[PDB]
Amino acid sequence: DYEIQRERIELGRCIGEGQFGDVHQGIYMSPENPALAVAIKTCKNCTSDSVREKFLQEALTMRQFDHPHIVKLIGVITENPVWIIMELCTLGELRSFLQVRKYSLDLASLILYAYQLSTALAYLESKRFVHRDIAARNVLVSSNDCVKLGDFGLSRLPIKWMAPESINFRRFTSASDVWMFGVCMWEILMHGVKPFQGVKNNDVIGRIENGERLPMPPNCPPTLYSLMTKCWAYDPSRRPRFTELKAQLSTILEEEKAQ
Numbered sequence: 001d002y003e004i005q006r007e008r009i010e011l012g013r014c015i016g017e018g019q020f021g022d023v024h025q026g027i028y029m030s031p032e033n034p035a036l037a038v039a040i041k042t043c044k045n046c047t048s049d050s051v052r053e054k055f056l057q058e059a060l061t062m063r064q065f066d067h068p069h070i071v072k073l074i075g076v077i078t079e080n081p082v083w084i085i086m087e088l089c090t091l092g093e094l095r096s097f098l099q100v101r102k103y104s105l106d107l108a109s110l111i112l113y114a115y116q117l118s119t120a121l122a123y124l125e126s127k128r129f130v131h132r133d134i135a136a137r138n139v140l141v142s143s144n145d146c147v148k149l150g151d152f153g154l155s156r157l158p159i160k161w162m163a164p165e166s167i168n169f170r171r172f173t174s175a176s177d178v179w180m181f182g183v184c185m186w187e188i189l190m191h192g193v194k195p196f197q198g199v200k201n202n203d204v205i206g207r208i209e210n211g212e213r214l215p216m217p218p219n220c221p222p223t224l225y226s227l228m229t230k231c232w233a234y235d236p237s238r239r240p241r242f243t244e245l246k247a248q249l250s251t252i253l254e255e256e257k258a259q
């Protein structure tokens with residue numbers, strides 16, 4: 001059972017918003033342990049049974065996964081006010097983490113973050129789960145040596161990250177997740193810059209259709225840029241699988257550490 005007693009949670013400052021309400025940082029005091037920092041998703045309209053069901057299904061969605069690079073569910077409080085208690089990735093959003101540390105993070109750390117996310121995505125592809133919202137804004141930082149995919153509810157169009165078949169035909173597969181992951185890798189190697197800054201979504205659709213791609217980030221190893229371009233194959237069958245990305249990223253990471 002994962003019902004948590006409300007008196008064991010202390011609500012802290014707001015760290016984001018969700019479809020159902022504000023998200024807070026806080027503290028959980030379990031019966032046997034010292035303080036555990038947690039994130040608390042709140043729900044304004046969970047007095048309505050359909051809202052409570054949809055909100056608590058976000059906790060059930062995370063509960064089905066168990067991976068070191070995907071945020072974990074700690075517990076839930078199912079009576080009003082309804083809360084979902086998640087693991088807190090203390091260092092916060094990946095984009096601002098990379099922006100602040102642009103001149104202090106080694107290139108090996110950036111490649112490590114891409115590798116870690118590829119392991120989580122290979123795990124999700126083994127469970128036949130299609131994410132649809134892979135982007136640096138949906139990655140959190142647990143430590144300088146650990147990133148995680150964020151909560152799937154809070155991660156929920158992102159045209160600038162989407163494969164052409166998803167934009168145009170609403171087809172969402174592991175191959176369309178691979179295209180998004182290529183964009184996320186580009187964001188990481190760009191220190192948290194977003195794809196296609198300033199460009200209108202409709203223009204991006206035509207540009208990608210005609211072969212334009214995001215350029216090689218400064219200092220990105222050419223082998224890693226080559227791998228990103230394979231993620232952006234127009235034909236989804238030509239994109240690598242997540243297990244292939246995981247193996248290739250491990251090779252690129254080792255090579256960078258050896259330099």
Ligand SMILES: CS(=O)(=O)c1cccc(CNc2nc(Nc3ccc4c(c3)CCC(=O)N4)ncc2C(F)(F)F)c1
Pocket residue numbers: 015016023025039040041071086087088089090091092093137138139140149150151152154155
């Ligand atoms: C879509 S997403 O990638 O899920 C995401 C993005 C942004 C915000 C949130 C809030 N939710 C969570 N935030 C955190 N860590 C966190 C976030 C922001 C900040 C801090 C820590 C302290 C420094 C600061 O200023 N902000 N850990 C876990 C979660 C939970 F609930 F998703 F599991 C989620």
